[PDB]
Design a protein around this ligand. Sequence first.
Ligand SMILES: *[C@@]1(=O)C(=O)[N]C2=C([C])[C]=[C][C]=C21
Ligand SMILES: *[C@@]1(=O)C(=O)[N]C2=C([C])[C]=[C][C]=C21
Ligand SMILES: [Cl-]
Ligand SMILES: [Cl-]
Lengths: 187, 187
Amino acid sequence: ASKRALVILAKGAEEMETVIPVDVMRRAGIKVTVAGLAGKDPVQCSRDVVICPDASLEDAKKEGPYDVVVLPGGNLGAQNLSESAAVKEILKEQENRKGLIAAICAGPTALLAHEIGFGSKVTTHPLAKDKMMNGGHYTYSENRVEKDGLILTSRGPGTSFEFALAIVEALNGKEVAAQVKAPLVLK
Amino acid sequence: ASKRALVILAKGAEEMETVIPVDVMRRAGIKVTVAGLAGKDPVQCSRDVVICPDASLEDAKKEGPYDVVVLPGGNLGAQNLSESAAVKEILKEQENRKGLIAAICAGPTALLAHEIGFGSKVTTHPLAKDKMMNGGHYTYSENRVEKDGLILTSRGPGTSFEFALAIVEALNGKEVAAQVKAPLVLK
Ligand SMILES: *[C@@]1(=O)C(=O)[N]C2=C([C])[C]=[C][C]=C21
Ligand SMILES: *[C@@]1(=O)C(=O)[N]C2=C([C])[C]=[C][C]=C21
Ligand SMILES: [Cl-]
Ligand SMILES: [Cl-]
């Protein structure tokens, strides 16, 4: 049975941090749902790329749970995720069931907002560190990708391939990740 | 005056190779037009990410010329670009005016199709080499990014940041490219 990923797409999401994981996960044979926070309508990302979601979050929630819940960054996207009671509910559920939660750049700050994964070692974008560390609820890491307990985090657009491949490894194993990686022409 | 980029978006385009250059160029202050080959409607990319173009190609052509014309890859996207008389016209015009032409992965095969830049040193995805080299009209390179005469080429999703930053350097200079690069958290 194929693994399933939920990628939550909010206004102001970093479009690279959205598309790279979506695409790489699909290359891995993961069934990915790009779910619009606001509804079914197209989403204006941080650098004005407009992406049509596969479904509203409301509807995608009905088809859960998922093997991974993915939170892109972009400061304003992460802020929208942080303010959402629907996101809170999804993440709490995922945490309760011991499922993978993945977040990149400023995305991990939504974990703080929703009180998810306290005590975990995490990374963020350098510019998001102080926000993430308010209260000392996590242990900070400068690794490009970090993973502790349920929580997989990464730093920025430039770590998005590494982040995506870590998700692939967690869901489908090291061999599939390596097979997906090779045709990408990564460094 | 800001530099201007035309990114031609066809069905089957590799969405990473589309979004990374769009986003990075916008970070550089370049005015980017994502132009839909088929018209104004949303475009289903290779891994099913759906992107709404800024304009149809028909309309974007009217606002040219541009400082760079960018051809994403994705085999089926590149094939659609290769078959298009409108693309032929745009590239011929850009070549005639000694403007930058940039293409990635299988994207450079559209240059072959349209007889653009013969004699240039080029790279492609490894799997697109034999197509690109049919007739020996170009000189092949294994560099991650290659640039010769008017023609800037690159290899794959994993070289997209390098490709984008090369475009930024060509248009806006080395210092802007470096400033845009730093916050990305590239290796
Ligand atoms: C991330 O994409 C993000 O979420 N925030 C941020 C900043 C402030 C700079 C560069 C990259 C990013
Ligand atoms: C490129 O994106 C492309 O245009 N073609 C291709 C192939 C065949 C494999 C991996 C990446 C790419
Ligand atoms: Cl941001
Ligand atoms: Cl392809």
